[PDB]
Curated annotation (Swiss-Prot), chain A:
This is U4/U6 small nuclear ribonucleoprotein Prp31. The modification Phosphoserine is found at S39. Involved in pre-mRNA splicing as component of the spliceosome. Required for the assembly of the U4/U5/U6 tri-snRNP complex, one of the building blocks of the spliceosome. It is linked to Retinitis pigmentosa 11: A retinal dystrophy belonging to the group of pigmentary retinopathies. Retinitis pigmentosa is characterized by retinal pigment deposits visible on fundus examination and primary loss of rod photoreceptor cells followed by secondary loss of cone photoreceptors. Patients typically have night vision blindness and loss of midperipheral visual field. As their condition progresses, they lose their far peripheral visual field and eventually central vision as well. A motif (Nuclear localization signal (NLS)) lies at residues 11-24.
Curated annotation (Swiss-Prot), chain B:
It is found in: Nucleus; Nucleus speckle. The MPN (JAB/Mov34) domain mediates interaction with TSSC4 and SNRNP200. Has structural similarity with deubiquitinating enzymes, but lacks the residues that would bind the catalytic metal ion. It is linked to Retinitis pigmentosa 13: A retinal dystrophy belonging to the group of pigmentary retinopathies. Retinitis pigmentosa is characterized by retinal pigment deposits visible on fundus examination and primary loss of rod photoreceptor cells followed by secondary loss of cone photoreceptors. Patients typically have night vision blindness and loss of midperipheral visual field. As their condition progresses, they lose their far peripheral visual field and eventually central vision as well. Residues 227-240 are annotated as: Important for branch point selection. It comes from the Eukaryota. Widely expressed. Coiled coil: none annotated. Residues 25-271 are annotated as: Linker. The modification N6-acetyllysine is found at K177. The gene is PRPF8. The modification N6,N6-dimethyllysine is found at K139. The chain holds residues 1280 to 1557 of 2335 of the full protein. It comes from Homo sapiens. This is Pre-mRNA-processing-splicing factor 8.
From Swiss-Prot, chain C:
Involved in pre-mRNA splicing as component of the U4/U6-U5 tri-snRNP complex, one of the building blocks of the spliceosome. Enhances dihydrotestosterone-induced transactivation activity of AR, as well as dexamethasone-induced transactivation activity of NR3C1, but does not affect estrogen-induced transactivation. It is found in: Nucleus, Nucleoplasm; Nucleus speckle. The modification Phosphoserine is found at S10. The chain holds residues 270 to 337 of 941 of the full protein. This is Pre-mRNA-processing factor 6. It is linked to Retinitis pigmentosa 60: A retinal dystrophy belonging to the group of pigmentary retinopathies. Retinitis pigmentosa is characterized by retinal pigment deposits visible on fundus examination and primary loss of rod photoreceptor cells followed by secondary loss of cone photoreceptors. Patients typically have night vision blindness and loss of midperipheral visual field. As their condition progresses, they lose their far peripheral visual field and eventually central vision as well.
Curated annotation (Swiss-Prot), chain G:
Interacts with HNRNPK. The gene is RBM42. It comes from the Eukaryota. It is found in: Nucleus; Cytoplasm. Residues 13-91 form the RRM domain. Binds (via the RRM domain) to the 3'-untranslated region (UTR) of CDKN1A mRNA. This is RNA-binding protein 42. Belongs to the RRM RBM42 family.
Amino acid sequence: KPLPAPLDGQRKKRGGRRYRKMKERLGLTEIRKQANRMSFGEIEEDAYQE
Amino acid sequence: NTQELLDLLVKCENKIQTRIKIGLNSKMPSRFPPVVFYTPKELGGLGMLSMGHVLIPQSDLRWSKQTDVGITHFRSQLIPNLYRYIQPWESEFIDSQRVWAEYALKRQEAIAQNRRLTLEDLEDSWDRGIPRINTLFQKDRHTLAYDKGWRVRTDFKQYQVLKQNPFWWTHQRHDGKLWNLNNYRTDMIQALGGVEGILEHTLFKGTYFPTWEGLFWEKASGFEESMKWKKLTNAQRSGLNQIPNRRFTLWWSPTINRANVYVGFQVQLDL
Amino acid sequence: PKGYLTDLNSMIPGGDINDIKKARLLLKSVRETNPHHPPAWIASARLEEVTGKLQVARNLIMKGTE
Amino acid sequence: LIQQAMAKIMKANPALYVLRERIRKGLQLYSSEPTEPYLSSQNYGELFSNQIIWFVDDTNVYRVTIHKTFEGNLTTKPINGAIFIFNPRTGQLFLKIIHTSVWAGQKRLGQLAKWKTAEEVAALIRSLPVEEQPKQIIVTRKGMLDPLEVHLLDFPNIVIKGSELQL
Amino acid sequence: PTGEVLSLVGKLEGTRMGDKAQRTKPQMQEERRAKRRKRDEDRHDINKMKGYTLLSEGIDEM
Amino acid sequence: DTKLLILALERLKEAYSVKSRLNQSQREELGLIEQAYDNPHEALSRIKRHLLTQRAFKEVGIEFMDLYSHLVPVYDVEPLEKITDAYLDQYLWYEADKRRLFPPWIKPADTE
Amino acid sequence: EDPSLLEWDADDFRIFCGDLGNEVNDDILARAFSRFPSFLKAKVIRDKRTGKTKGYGFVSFKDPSDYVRAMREMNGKYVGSRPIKLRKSMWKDRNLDVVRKKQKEK
Amino acid sequence: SYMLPHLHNGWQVDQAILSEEDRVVVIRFGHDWDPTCMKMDEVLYSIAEKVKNFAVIYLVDITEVPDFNKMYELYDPCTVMFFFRNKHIMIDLGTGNNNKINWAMEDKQEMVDIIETVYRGARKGRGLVVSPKDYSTKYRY
Amino acid sequence: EEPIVNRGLAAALLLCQNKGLLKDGYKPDVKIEYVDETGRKLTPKEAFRQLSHRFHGKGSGKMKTERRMKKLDEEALLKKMLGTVALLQE
């Protein structure tokens, strides 16, 4: 199958209603804090544990 | 012991840095500052370990601080080698033998006094010897007693996993952590010129933050909430992966956009 | 092989695993919110004895008695 | 004169502040920030001011009753709960009733129940008009102010503060 | 003073491998000691009457 | 049996390093792993049934680790078969070390 | 209250066509209207002493179903140098504002 | 072989560029015998039908059609030219000149990404688009 | 718990404190503040927006102006101040 022609329509016109369940499936309300944070100053766990 | 290996490691390190440098710019950056490479990730650098002899020039160890009274200048060496923080195998083995004999006598005397060997007791020999005695204090201790044949399993894991395993010879859970680089990171920060000395190479002073104690980055945030889950095109994925490189370059602009790093091509920005 | 299997067949018993996990979580929350509630301790002991092992039920009964 | 002029212009210039904010956004430096002071015995006196403040207690939202039978079993029936949003200035207590069927058959942990409670608090705040919407929220439970900052992202003028004295 | 990594060979050749090899300490030892002290103090009456039964003891009722 | 099954499931889950982008096979294996972890007894019964009766299996996918010195074979197995094999491996190793099947000279030993 | 809507408002359908070329589509809107079945008016909102259009323009079409069909067909159509986006004209006048205020309190 | 359509005169080229309104016109200036052109045309045929929705490819012989040599600086053995709605699109590959590829990449996915980026930038309105890769370094190690 | 006593200013100050309502040679008081035509102090973002609007020579649109005016009216109404209906309905 040929690759569909790329396009950029309006991302979203309305919100609420079902839109919320949509994100709930993928993009639900995670911790959203201390997971994508780095803590500029100090070090968590070991230095180069990775 | 192996001199050819040391030459190989210094060559590979020079290659890795080169790769990063070329990514930063096509032109060869004569006298590129090493501070960007060896600075720990939490402080904005790449957090790269060193095995070669790297001399940090004194010219890169000066930093300024402004108070209402005026501006005051300050000064602070060689980059530490990781091997210095790695206990030799022979010392590891003799240490392990003596520490486990000590643990045997401590355990028998605790049993004599109806006591359980404490992790604090193990703390005395905190992970002493080649193996980490600390494991004696892990929760899965009872569960891991049935995980027989784990070294051979880890060695054979290469036939089942598409990711190459460098620590194929050991398991973190069973053998413990045989190495520690916390003091390595501390000495890296000190040798690079201290926290403020390193930050002088960055745009931290440009943010006008009164102190660096309570700050934090936002890894994978971007302008679109990082847009991680999507049906995005491969080119868009490459752009998203290159965005953190944009953040890194912006962070280290004050020390790489200088005329010492690049000779010639002094072009003013538009307007 | 057949004989062993039959025994396995006969050995097949609990109910829903997710409902039992939610009931165990509710019993743990009731024990954490009220340590001095012997109906909560009796419900946690009944939930730990109706499914799983009896050693955890005996430990929960001892914790509720203490 | 020039000294204090430079001091004040580095401290509070609008354009310089915009430059700093743009640099911070480009660097993604989300420096950590402290929360508001909790409702102690010396901070409750501001609760009766002209600003509309509300205290949200949701500890009695999820409640169950253990009915133990004599022979055979012992049941645990979840009952309906009530999240209390009380205003100390007006004496109005909104008792949001949560039925037993919302938690009986959901197959979810407490991270979904706390999110549902924060969404119910946000819907109760949005159902009220802007003249009746409070500007200060006092969370009785310490594990409830963290989703309340997430569920009230459309109204940044409200303050989600903790409480040291549990009502 | 370029940024080229010079060879370790010869550079601090034969350097102490344990020079920077500091050992890690067990963290959260005070909280574990406090939890052990609370578990030892909460089970004092259970350990004092562990071997004393209701039928085969003479100092049970007292 | 429960301890060996838990160890096998932990080993299988460990092999899946977090990349957040998994194919259908990896997510299916994760689903089977968590389902077996939730109810160990039914998984153990299924594993024993497979060991007693099953003799025909599905295709094993192959790939090559491209170490520039030499290619290394890598085999991808169906997740149910993977779980059965992992439990069998754990049980076999535990019982062999209990009975001292392998003489000392046979390394790589787990004590050094 | 600019007196300019008294020439095209004839109980017709007004379509706001924006996202067009600033230096283009000066009279191309007239060609589009002529292509449209109604072909009533294709006024372009432009600023005096500017030399360029102000962006969105008002196309008045008498036939409402034909206007809707044209809007469906011409939505995103490449007209001039940029695709013109067609939407419904607002036309919020003083009487409309008063009616909205009256309906807001009730 | 070369199943890709060919243009035998400047007229074919200059109405082929104006023929497509919703698709990017790709023109390979060069010679079939030229090996580099052979590699690029093999890559293009490998993706000729994949980009049928939003792109079209035409092959132009320099000897057959030499009128574009002076205006487009067609002095390389091979060039690739991108047009949309009669407007050329420059691509910032990092090679110094943004007008033409001037090289044959073996990976078809790179060309697919390049043409997709060109289409995205042309439909949005930018005349100059940025390649989602840097080709200054061959990335060989 | 302190009422407003007649002919006394210390009681109102105590109630407001309990409620939480509170070279040539010279020392030049160089004070720089951002204000608007309404006299209200402006946030740095608002001051920067005003400066940029004045420098660019073009202000905000009609919709943005209406939204700002409505927000200002709402803020004024809120700062100027359903229990009785809930008591009568119960």
